[PDB]
Amino acid sequence: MTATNKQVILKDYVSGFPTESDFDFTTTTVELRVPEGTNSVLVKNLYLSCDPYMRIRMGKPDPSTAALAQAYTPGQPIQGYGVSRIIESGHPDYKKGDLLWGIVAWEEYSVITPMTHAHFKIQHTDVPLSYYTGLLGMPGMTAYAGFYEVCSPKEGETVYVSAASGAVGQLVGQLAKMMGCYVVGSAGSKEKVDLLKTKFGFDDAFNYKEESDLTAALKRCFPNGIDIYFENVGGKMLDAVLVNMNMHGRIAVCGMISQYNLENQEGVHNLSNIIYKRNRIQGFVVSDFYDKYSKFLEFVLPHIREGKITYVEDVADGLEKAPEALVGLFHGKNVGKQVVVVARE
Amino acid sequence: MTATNKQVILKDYVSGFPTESDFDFTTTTVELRVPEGTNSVLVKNLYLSCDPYMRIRMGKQAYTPGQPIQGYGVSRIIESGHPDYKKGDLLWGIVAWEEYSVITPMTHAHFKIQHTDVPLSYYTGLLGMPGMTAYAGFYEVCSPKEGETVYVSAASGAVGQLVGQLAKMMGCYVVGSAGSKEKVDLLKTKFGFDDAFNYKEESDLTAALKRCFPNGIDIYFENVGGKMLDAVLVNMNMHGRIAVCGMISQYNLENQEGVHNLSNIIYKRNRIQGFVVSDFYDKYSKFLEFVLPHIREGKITYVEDVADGLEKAPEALVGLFHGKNVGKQVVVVARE
Ligand SMILES: NC(=O)c1ccc[n+]([C@@H]2O[C@H](COP(=O)([O-])OP(=O)(O)OC[C@H]3O[C@@H](n4cnc5c(N)ncnc54)[C@H](OP(=O)(O)O)[C@@H]3O)[C@@H](O)[C@H]2O)c1
Ligand SMILES: NC(=O)c1ccc[n+]([C@@H]2O[C@H](COP(=O)([O-])OP(=O)(O)OC[C@H]3O[C@@H](n4cnc5c(N)ncnc54)[C@H](OP(=O)(O)O)[C@@H]3O)[C@@H](O)[C@H]2O)c1
């Protein structure tokens, strides 16, 4: 049997921002039986993610960026994290009808090899299959091992979270409230800042966009200053944190989404302050910690199921809407994690 | 005895680079008495240190202008009221920039010299507060393994020169930069750094590091900032540490420059950890007992530039920010 397999292709390399135009559409004919090779499986991608790593995987091969996760080949389908179901297998741990999450291409049917810190088993289908592109996935694992491991948190301390009503950020601020920390958020709209103050249980929050003096916002919110900072923004925002940070204060550099879309990268001036304040700027990728994903799930699935972690998503229908759904993420049109549903169950 | 005390004042605060004309000489008369009050000693300042933190203290910590400049130095006790010191033994710590001073010892500001079988100007530098920076910042905050590669900026001087000696003792590959070909030559001649360049001869600073490191940079010891950190962040390796000691590029400025390449920290999984030496003084008696076997042996060396008297001590602190100092800028106030 042959399958009518629609795909989303990248045209060529990005300079600046993404547009629906830097992407294109094709169809192929992938047959519904076995792959022979290494330890190969043909899946059917049901859900897919729009994660921001994808910008500096959409750009021209720089040695800096190409030491994270490589570069997209022009005119071949966009790789990304997303939930998938086995049609036919050539692996032992995966049998016909099993589910996985991992790095699949933006196509309806993918021909992947499973390796251990890339593709992961779904043993738990007691809770949304969509969430393995988020909370029970890689955005949620960033937030576990990132906040607990490199922010090195200790109770009562004051946390700042930027890009806080979105997948990694909304989880950090919850995992922080669960230590009885003072968490303040920052997000782009009022819709976004209201969820921070209600649903996600942060103590205060602002809209950075509607804030003139970058620094003065963080001075009002934190009278006593900041101890932890979960960095999802950069530039203008890190300069604001370094005059507002307390002594032996830590910074976890998760991302820097303001920069990704720039060719001419913004200046961070106030780095002088980390001698004066004995501060720790620490960067990480999730991939280094995917060995403790067994140890993540054992914690989070007790806590979601009991009403201690909350999570919103931004679901769009089909591959057709997946250009649209990766573009306005860089402009912030997503309210929480941007999922794009290729097929449901 | 009732001798005169020549002193170096600060007139008014500094806004840019320090000129010799923001400092002037005045004189008091000190009675070489069993002294003032609280847990006091009267001291004679033998040697003084021209340290680059002093520009931040010339800002609006902070110095009180019309009074002396405070800094580190080696001094002999003249008369005591502290239970530890007696007449004729040796202290290092925060003295004032005069001939004779009345400081009260606080244990981790001021420290007693026992080993006098070493050049004593070395206790302003190698065995002082630049030396404890180079032990603490390299062994703890740079977190080193063997074979791993170190870049040291302002390698010439004080901190930077013991860092690169302690790395090719661990078994690392060490590179350093300096601003003249006298200071670059010193790195291969005296201290035996694997490679070295002149950063002033590089228009091409990101390429300069690509050249010196085929392997990449695992460890940086940051003494400088700005453009040099922007260049080292391109050049880093995976799970690469940067130990932020100083920023002499920035101290000097009423501008204070921007570092554009901090996105590299997610990708190359970097630790930029800033420290203060004062926090590590509990580990001074462990440092002192490690390095003095090796200094005595001739294995750890040091280059100093010495200025003679309080006269040529503005000329010495001004000149530090340009880099007229070939190594550590010490001032001798008194000969033995
Ligand atoms: N370290 C890792 O390995 C790893 C893993 C996953 C994610 N990340 C990183 O962390 C960040 C995002 O978290 P996420 O994946 O959960 O996505 P997300 O937070 O769901 O969505 C991205 C957010 O981007 C914000 N934004 C867009 N342009 C902005 C700008 N110019 N300035 C400030 N904010 C802007 C938007 O907020 P607003 O609407 O609030 O402006 C939007 O909600 C990214 O930088 C990403 O690369 C890193
Ligand atoms: N606990 C701490 O964190 C702590 C403690 C002690 C010292 N420190 C810091 O570390 C530094 C002091 O010792 P050191 O090893 O640097 O040697 P130094 O000999 O005391 O300092 C002078 C050197 O500064 C360099 N320099 C001056 N202006 C510069 C500029 N415009 N751009 C780039 N480089 C410039 C020059 O070298 P070149 O021209 O040869 O490069 C010069 O030889 C200071 O930044 C100081 O504040 C920090």
CSV table of C-alpha atoms in Angstrom, one decimal, chain A residues 56 63-65 67-68 238 248 253-256 259-260 265-269 271-272 274-276 278-285 287-288, chain B residues 56 141 229 234 238-239 244-247 251 256-276 279-280:
chain,number,residue,atom,x,y,z
A,56,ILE,CA,19.6,28.9,14.2
A,63,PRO,CA,30.8,26.9,13.6
A,64,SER,CA,29.1,28.4,16.6
A,65,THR,CA,25.5,27.3,15.8
A,67,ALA,CA,27.7,22.8,17.6
A,68,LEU,CA,24.3,22.4,19.1
A,238,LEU,CA,20.2,40.8,30.7
A,248,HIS,CA,26.3,35.0,44.6
A,253,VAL,CA,21.0,30.7,29.8
A,254,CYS,CA,18.4,28.6,28.2
A,255,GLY,CA,17.9,30.8,25.2
A,256,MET,CA,18.2,34.2,23.8
A,259,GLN,CA,19.0,37.5,19.0
A,260,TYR,CA,18.2,34.7,16.7
A,265,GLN,CA,23.6,40.9,17.5
A,266,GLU,CA,22.7,43.2,20.3
A,267,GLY,CA,25.1,44.5,22.9
A,268,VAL,CA,25.2,43.4,26.6
A,269,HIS,CA,27.0,46.1,28.5
A,271,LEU,CA,28.8,42.1,32.5
A,272,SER,CA,31.2,44.1,34.6
A,274,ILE,CA,29.5,39.8,37.8
A,275,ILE,CA,32.8,40.4,39.7
A,276,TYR,CA,31.2,42.9,42.0
A,278,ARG,CA,30.1,37.0,42.4
A,279,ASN,CA,27.5,35.8,39.8
A,280,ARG,CA,27.3,32.7,37.6
A,281,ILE,CA,26.2,32.9,33.9
A,282,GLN,CA,25.6,29.2,33.0
A,283,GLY,CA,24.5,27.9,29.6
A,284,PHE,CA,23.0,24.5,28.8
A,285,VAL,CA,21.3,22.4,26.1
A,287,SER,CA,20.5,16.9,25.4
A,288,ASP,CA,23.3,16.7,28.1
B,56,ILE,CA,36.7,52.1,40.6
B,141,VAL,CA,36.6,28.9,39.3
B,229,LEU,CA,35.6,38.5,25.3
B,234,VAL,CA,33.6,32.7,19.1
B,238,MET,CA,32.1,22.7,24.4
B,239,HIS,CA,31.8,22.8,28.3
B,244,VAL,CA,36.1,36.6,35.2
B,245,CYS,CA,38.8,38.3,37.3
B,246,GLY,CA,38.8,41.8,35.9
B,247,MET,CA,37.7,44.1,33.1
B,251,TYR,CA,37.2,50.8,34.3
B,256,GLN,CA,31.2,51.0,29.2
B,257,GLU,CA,31.2,48.7,26.1
B,258,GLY,CA,28.9,46.0,24.7
B,259,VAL,CA,29.5,42.3,24.3
B,260,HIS,CA,27.6,41.0,21.3
B,261,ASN,CA,28.5,37.3,21.3
B,262,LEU,CA,26.8,35.9,24.4
B,263,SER,CA,24.4,33.6,22.4
B,264,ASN,CA,27.4,31.2,22.1
B,265,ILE,CA,26.9,30.2,25.8
B,266,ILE,CA,23.7,28.0,25.0
B,267,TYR,CA,25.6,26.3,22.1
B,268,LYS,CA,29.1,25.9,23.5
B,269,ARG,CA,27.7,25.2,27.1
B,270,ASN,CA,29.6,27.9,28.9
B,271,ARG,CA,30.3,29.0,32.5
B,272,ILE,CA,31.2,32.7,32.8
B,273,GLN,CA,31.8,32.8,36.6
B,274,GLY,CA,32.9,36.0,38.2
B,275,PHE,CA,34.9,35.9,41.5
B,276,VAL,CA,36.4,38.2,44.3
B,279,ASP,CA,36.4,35.1,49.6
B,280,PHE,CA,39.2,32.7,49.2
